Amino acid sequence: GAMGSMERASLIQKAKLAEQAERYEDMAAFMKGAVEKGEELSCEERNLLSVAYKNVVGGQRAAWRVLSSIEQKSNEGPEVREYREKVETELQGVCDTVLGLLDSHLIKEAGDAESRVFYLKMKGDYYRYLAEVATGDDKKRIIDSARSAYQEAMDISKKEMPPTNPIRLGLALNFSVFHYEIANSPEEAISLAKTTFDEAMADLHTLSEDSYKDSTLIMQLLRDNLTLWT
Amino acid sequence: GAMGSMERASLIQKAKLAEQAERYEDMAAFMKGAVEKGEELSCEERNLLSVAYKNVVGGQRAAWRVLSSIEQKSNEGPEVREYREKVETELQGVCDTVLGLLDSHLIKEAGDAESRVFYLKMKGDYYRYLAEVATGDDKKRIIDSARSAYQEAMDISKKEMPPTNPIRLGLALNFSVFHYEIANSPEEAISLAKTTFDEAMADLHTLSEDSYKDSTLIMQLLRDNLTLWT
Amino acid sequence: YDLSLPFP
Amino acid sequence: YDLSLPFP
Ligand SMILES: [Cl-]
Ligand SMILES: [Cl-]
Ligand SMILES: [Mg+2]
Ligand SMILES: [Mg+2]
Ligand SMILES: [Mg+2]
Ligand SMILES: [Mg+2]
Ligand SMILES: [Mg+2]
Ligand SMILES: [Mg+2]
């Protein structure tokens, strides 16, 4: 691609500058270029990749919701549908790009739990964003792809990580949200968030001050959803 | 361009949807397409054009300042300079696009004071944004282009508009900022803001409730700068 | 939306 | 910056 001529280290440096500048489309392009160098990503680099695309797709999701809401009010010219479709297609393209990077070849080469769970959670997340805008037949298959990715990530995280591990906690939070918002399974969402919270609570005594802060932050997010849902 | 096949009315409708969705790059592209239909813009349409590009260039200016600050700290690899240059070039391109639209042919066909002052103020604004990132020789010519556009707008607004007219007030505010921030003329900035404020104050008695609200809002902005500067 | 993890 | 008119 267009980043083929830039050094990997220069791409990472520019991704960090783009983050500071809140230039998230640039940041995503830089991190895509870094992934396409073919080497594995460090922990910091994985988080830069995720920050970049989370912000890009987050803007698209917010825009899609505004337009879909106007479109649905409009049905109580073709322009609202056309423009919603344009944004939807762009959103789908970003999700497909992220899923492509994970499939070529980040997940395949990810052997450690911290990297493999991170990437499989991302795969679940971006199928979930596809599911948010999907409708018929495709929606069922997209939902199952999200579920499968989250489930593999869950299986690894329960075998290989402590219950306070922030990657494990964030995965459980998002899988629970998948159950509630996508899969029409609020009871599974609640059960997963509660069991996750309770098992982390019992492990907090093992944690340093800084690890305690990181784990309790995500535990509070789990609690926030449980409060909303119960 | 790419909007050549879309109806003018559809472009305007989509610009409004893009505004609601905070998709300002789309909004700017739609309004550019509308301008390129060749017809004059209504008051509402002029404001859509300006909202769109103000938000696009505003993001670029904020990013450029972050990167320029990091670059200057860095000088107390080439990557910071390269990326700052990339953003700067993109910023310059947006400003050139806006100036191109004003020159082809919005200003030429603008005969009423409300439209001509609006466009000439915009021309001053976007030369001013070019001046913010300009350095040598070019900076002098860009500054003079900004000054000339603002000065013509000022001459028309003092002859044709009341001193409380919000277009006139906003032009005076921005020309005063030009004097302070660009032209190294803080005393002219202060004199212009004070005289503008005082002459509007004396005309407020003529205004309806809604016109009073609009004019006093911009008068407060003038006061805010005077307080900062004195 | 807005229920998921707000960072990576 | 941030001294100019915050709308068109
Ligand atoms: Cl469209
Ligand atoms: Cl660059
Ligand atoms: Mg190399
Ligand atoms: Mg579609
Ligand atoms: Mg029940
Ligand atoms: Mg037509
Ligand atoms: Mg340059
Ligand atoms: Mg003095």
Numbering used by the authors:
A (entry chain A), B (entry chain A): -4 to 71, 78 to 231
C (entry chain P), D (entry chain P): 136 to 143
What does the paper say about this structure?
The 14-3-3σ protein, which has multiple interacting partners with specific peptidic motifs, was used as a case study. Furthermore, different isoforms of the 14-3-3 protein are function-specific. For example, the 14-3-3σ isoform (but not other isoforms) specifically targets p53 and is associated with tumour suppression, making it invaluable to determine crystal structures of the target peptide with the correct isoform.
To address this problem, we present a combined co-crystallization and peptide-soaking approach to obtain crystals for any 14-3-3σ–peptide complex that may exhibit difficulties when crystallizing under our optimized ‘sigma’ conditions. The second step involves, after these 14-3-3σ–cJun-pS227 crystals are fully grown, displacement of the c-Jun peptide via addition of the desired peptide for the final structure at high concentration to the crystal drop and incubation for a period of time until full occupancy of the peptide is achieved. Not only does this significantly reduce the production time, but new 14-3-3–peptide structures that were previously not accessible with the 14-3-3σ isoform, despite screening hundreds of other different conditions, were now also able to be resolved. The new strategy that we present here has allowed the determination of several new structures of 14-3-3σ which had not previously been possible, illustrating the ease and success of the method. All models were determined to belong to the orthorhombic space group C2221 using Zanuda. In addition, the method retains the robust, stable, high-resolution and well diffracting features of crystals originally grown in the sigma screen.
